[PDB]
Amino acid sequence: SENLKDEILEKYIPKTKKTRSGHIVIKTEETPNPEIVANTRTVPGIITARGCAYAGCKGVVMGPIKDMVHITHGPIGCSFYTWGGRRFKSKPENGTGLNFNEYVFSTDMQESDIVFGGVNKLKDAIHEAYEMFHPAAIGVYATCPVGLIGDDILAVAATASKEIGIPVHAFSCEGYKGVSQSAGHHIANNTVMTDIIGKGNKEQKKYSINVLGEYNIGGDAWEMDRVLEKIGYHVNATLTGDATYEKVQNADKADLNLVQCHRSINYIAEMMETKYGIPWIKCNFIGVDGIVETLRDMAKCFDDPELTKRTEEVIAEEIAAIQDDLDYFKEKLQGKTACLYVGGSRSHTYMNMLKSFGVDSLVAGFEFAHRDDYEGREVIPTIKIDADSKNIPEITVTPDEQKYRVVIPEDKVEELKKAGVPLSSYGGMMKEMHDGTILIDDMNHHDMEVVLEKLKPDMFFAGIKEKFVIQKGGVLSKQLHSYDYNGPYAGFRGVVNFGHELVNGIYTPAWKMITPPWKKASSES
Template identity: 30%
Template sequence: MKDGKNLDSHGTEINVTPIKEREKSIHVNSGECGMNMNCDGNSVSGSVSQRACVYCGARVVLNPITDAYHIVHGPIGCASYTWDIRGSLSSGEEIYRNSFSTDLREKDIIFGGEKKLTEAIKEIVEQNNPKLIFVYSTCIVGVIGDDTQAVCRQAEKDYGIRVIPVFSPGFAGNKSMGYKAACNALISLMGEEKQEKVEGINFLGDFNLSGEMWMLTNYLKNLGINIISKITGDASYDEIIKAPSATLNIVQCAGSMTFLAKKMEELYDIPFVKISFIGVEDTIQSIRTIVDVIGDEEMKEKAEKFIEEMFAKTDKELAYYREKLKGKKAAINVGGAFKAISLIKQFNDLGIQTVMVGTQTGKKDDYEIIRSISDEGTIILDDTNPYEIEKFVKQTEADILVGGVKERPLAYKLGLAFVDHNHERKHPLTGFEGAINFAREVHESVNNPVWKFIKQEKMKGDDNYVKELCELECESM
């Protein structure tokens, strides 16, 4: 900031004039501490927000448990909305890819849906012989007041299996509240009794979207670290109930799993550390943090040799992409702040400047870290909306947007390169291999010749637009 004006790192003035309700959710990094970001609140009903509902937050955490059955107690739309929502990979059961619903209609809403839920549980038990069923309460159930807890409790007595209610009516909070509801359901599954300790760790907060859990647990196993349970990517009922016996929890997705880690520390005396395997820098730091906490000297030596070998190989391949990407500008809009922080570091390593960064579930401490590692003039957003993303992407002249499925159409509409770092990606973007995959995807997207033919909206009214477009076409031939 200079003379009361918001300036980017090149001294260009940034025009930020939000509506009153958004004033404390938009911040331009001036290099000063204490930005007082308004965050971690509930979205106003009816407002245009990127933040998902409570039910969605609960479902995305629990859905990757491969042998669990998920009954959505509510209208069919809720079940279809989250069907196979994360595309998580499995090495065992595939039943989690299905979605079951009580399909509540007008009559059920008037007279109650408990009987329908009881019948749905009975049908699944008789046809499939499950070990575990989750029952999600949606908005309408929160309104009509069905006692899902009593129905689930009775089902456990009748069938001798775990039937766990997940209290997730969407209007009761935000996506973060859904994470907590899922974590409470996991605690219910594990039970509150302590177990005899086994030397090993629980890996919390990776959902195995593209096989990352397999890759990262292989890293740890090669160092001699025993994995007790994975929560929840490629997890199973049998391994989750063993989780209380672990001696350490590592937390990859801080937004969804810190609550669970704190509860497990309280109930089972399991300490935890937050880690991130996104990008080379954070991957190296995470490996060192884990082995330091375990405290085995031989393991530390193995870790340093592994890091040296993998870094040399990875850095050599990244050198090519650094040359191609140097000087580009990136905008970020993701769910968790831990991912945004890692992405800023990753872009810095590639020579790319982050000009905008937003999250859905960031906390004040997270935003302070984002401020400290981003350049002066970087726009920082909490729970932003499509209008703001479009405005600031254009204003900062970003070359690429990193986000999820909701941001993809917006990026393409703006003629902007895009990388999906969330639900729909088909290759791992974590660890050393993931760092190479990410750099390759950014390069292939931002340096794609197609962008030569797609001009920004400001050129549409230019008389020379068609002429310039033709010249570009001739140059590419």
């Protein structure tokens, strides 16, 4: 359809009207699922939700590893604003071990460093961080001025590595790269893949699983790994959250990779299949359907009925305790309408869950994700690069001569074929969205106010900037990023926390008492 595109586009000056246009797509059966324009420049002076390259690299992929001091090279706010903002949970490895979640380390650049590039203040701060805390590795991250003042944070880490004797990893993620934090993921995924996965010894166990791309926000991974510990799977590495450097290093002591977030870890999912023969699956541990399917798919990739039998037993057991609440949740919430806007992947996963409560997701979109996250992985042969995206170096992986194996032969095609087990595939969001559904890439402050005033959603799931705008006009914004300081929202157990939190949030008494007696009635008293 096209009619709401005109209500939104009506106001834009025509040059912005032209650019903006491809980013708003409406799904019609007619146009049986279409193409959106994702991952280009943000338009200046539009109010967007989006970030910087460093926000996806230090912020989200690298930040989570618990025993590496992660130091920022640049002025203070790049470190300050990473200090407990995104809430990934660690606890030290097995009571002992390091945990650095509580601190932020910086080089606090000053004007002399900006004019005479602070590379010994990095040499010094690197040796200092090591002497004080003697960590597993140290990671140096780049901020906007490092690049321009010519600081080769890469060379400094190489010298550093050899005097200090610890891995010191340099990451160039200056906030003026790409167009959003999606670019940042790509930059980080490369250094991990090369110089930390694979390096290591720890021999593998049976049923070794890795959950890839799960930053354990609000406990989520501890929850998935509860249910899987429970089947007999050995999750070798969650890539990240509560990940030890030593556990990332041996992430090849696995059998399947289970990509939960496709937009941040697909580069590794791909490069691993190639070097070691560790096939990836798209997995979804959010919402019951997503979860039951993920469990049955990976049990089908693994070969055996003992493990399929126990999966069915623990599937049952689990959803039956969770049942009467599921029921409750539906009865309070059916008929309501949601719009969803996160970045990368959470507008999609949280959808199955909302169908489970009878809520209709009318509108959805991402603030930094690419075309294959909406349409499908298929379209990746097909992409127009002018952009500014991962015009950021791409790297190539060749079979590890020694640790290469093919873990499933060609009944892999019997997976993809039969019962549609998602072996190395994703078919995005749009696919799942209902008809007469709207998708908006890098939706701004303008766009959500006509979606809000034209369409009237009962709830709107965005983030923090945006939370208090929606809430102020009398509609319920729950933030899907930071869980509204709750957790888990993954697994069978998260599902019931997400359910009540939402129930409670709609049935909040003060919602109905925003308008006073003298205004809405006694206008002259």
